[PDB]
């Protein structure tokens, strides 16, 4: 279920799910480096009926995973609301900015 773009935590992912790339929803595949920064999503949990803040930390320094590409735009906003925006590379500040995959880490309730 977490490999589906319809998985509720993936509501503002524009990228490849790391869980399809040898990582997991919350871990980078081997040899890919977590981004310290990210855009954040507000996604509705269908189980408990609540909305949660999800941090979309990219994994960086390897070329594109190419698996489970998702493009979901729930509550996503343009670059003038920069940390809600997913059309930029959140690997941008990494030692190496090459984009590999995206993680979907639950932060808390919205």
């Amino acid at each position: 279920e977490v490999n589906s773009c319809d998985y509720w935590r993936h509501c503002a992912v524009d990228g490849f799910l790391c869980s399809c790339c040898g990582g997991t929803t919350t871990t980078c595949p081997p040899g890919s480096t977590p981004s310290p920064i990210s855009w954040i999503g507000t996604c509705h949990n269908p189980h408990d009926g609540k909305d949660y803040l999800i941090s979309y930390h990219d994994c960086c320094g390897k070329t594109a995973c190419g698996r489970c590409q998702c493009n979901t735009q729930t509550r996503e906003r343009p670059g003038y609301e920069f940390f809600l925006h997913n059309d930029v590379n959140w690997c941008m500040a990494n030692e190496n900015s090459t984009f590999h995959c995206t993680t979907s880490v639950l932060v808390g309730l919205a």
């Binding site: 390897k62 003038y80 930029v88 690997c91 190496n96 090459t98």
Partner: protein, 358 residues
């Protein structure tokens, strides 16, 4: 008997040429610009643009500018962000201009990589992730100014009625105007009143740009305008793109470079889809609507062929649309656009097409 030769120029006249920025997202370190003849769909050439290239054509039509990122060993080693100048006819590299290592890495919105109306400065978006606008002096071949005044803002809207002024959209819902000196540093700036509610009616960043004013569309199908006929920007809106029948089906805009203005007629073109709701703002066009900006009323609607981005040629009265891979050419000399042809497989993953200036 025969010998292979190089050194050749693009076969088709400049007036026939369009530039399809293929991000090649699946292999984003090998992005490139595909050059096409829009009259017959012929592939004319390409310019390689490494990781997440951006592209524009010099206002004078002689040069192609690209912006990209390299590393010594691609996935490791030292980063070099650069603007490149390439010859438009030979499609050959001429020079590299160093940028600080914070040029925006992101999808090919027009407003991330632009130039002043006079062509003398390249104006680009930075994000480190703090935002600033970078200024590159074309004559010097040097980066000459970082506009930190634009922190918290996004994208570059050149003002077509001034040589070296542009606007950006800020997170207060207003516009910041920057007026450059002849050295490319900031001579003056001003901030508009709030144009739009960032929380309640966020706008798309893509302007529908006229000589002395810009129109923007919102997530909910409203239209806002910034008038820069004078030194201070005057803002207004919203008016709705939607009539009462449109409201039943929840029509809303969607796309990336999703709007355009035909300046002579005042006709604004917008990608639209029904069944609008939270999260549908990048959905492909079910339709293209054509709005008279003066009467604030739709004058036409045609099927959108799943387009996501567009561009307009003022002189030839043309609109191009792009679904990610295919380019459609429309004659827009009349209110209802007429489809002329489609160029299939122009790109793998392109959200930006541009005419060669003529």
């Amino acid at each position: 008997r025969e010998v292979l030769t190089g050194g050749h120029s693009v076969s088709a006249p400049q007036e026939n040429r369009i530039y399809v920025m293929d991000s090649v997202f699946m292999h984003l370190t090998e992005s490139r610009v595909h050059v096409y003849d829009y009259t017959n769909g012929k592939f004319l050439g390409m310019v390689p643009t490494a990781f997440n290239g951006h592209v524009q054509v010099s206002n004078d039509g002689k040069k192609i500018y690209t912006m990209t990122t390299y590393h010594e060993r691609i996935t490791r080693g030292k980063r070099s962000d650069v603007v490149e100048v390439w010859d438009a006819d030979k499609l050959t590299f001429e020079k590299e201009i160093s940028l600080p290592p914070k040029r925006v890495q992101g999808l090919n919105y027009d407003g991330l990589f632009r130039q002043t109306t006079d062509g003398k400065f390249i104006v680009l978006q930075n994000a480190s992730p703090a935002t600033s606008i970078g200024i590159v002096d074309v004559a010097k071949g040097d980066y000459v100014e970082d506009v930190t005044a634009a922190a918290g803002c996004w994208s570059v809207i050149p003002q077509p009625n001034r040589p070296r002024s542009f606007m950006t959209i800020c997170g207060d819902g207003g516009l910041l105007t920057i007026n450059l000196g002849e050295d490319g540093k900031v001579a003056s700036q001003s901030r508009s009143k709030q144009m739009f509610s960032v929380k309640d009616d966020p706008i798309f960043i893509a302007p529908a740009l006229d000589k002395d004013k810009a129109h923007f569309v919102s997530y909910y199908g409203n239209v806002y305008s910034a008038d820069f006929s004078g030194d201070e920007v005057k803002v207004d809106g919203p008016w709705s793109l939607l009539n009462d029948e449109d409201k039943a089906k929840n029509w809303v805009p969607g796309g990336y470079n999703l709007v355009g203005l035909h300046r002579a007629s005042g006709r604004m073109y917008v990608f639209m889809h029904p069944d609008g709701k939270e999260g549908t703002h990048k959905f492909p066009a079910a339709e293209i609507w054509v709005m008279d900006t003066k009467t604030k009323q739709r004058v036409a609607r045609i099927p959108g062929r799943d387009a996501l981005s567009m561009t307009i040629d003022q002189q030839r009265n043309l609109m191009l649309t792009l679904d990610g891979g295919n380019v459609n050419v429309y004659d827009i000399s009349q209110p209802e656009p007429k489809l002329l042809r489609t160029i299939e497989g122009a790109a793998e993953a392109s959200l930006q097409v541009q005419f060669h200036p003529v």
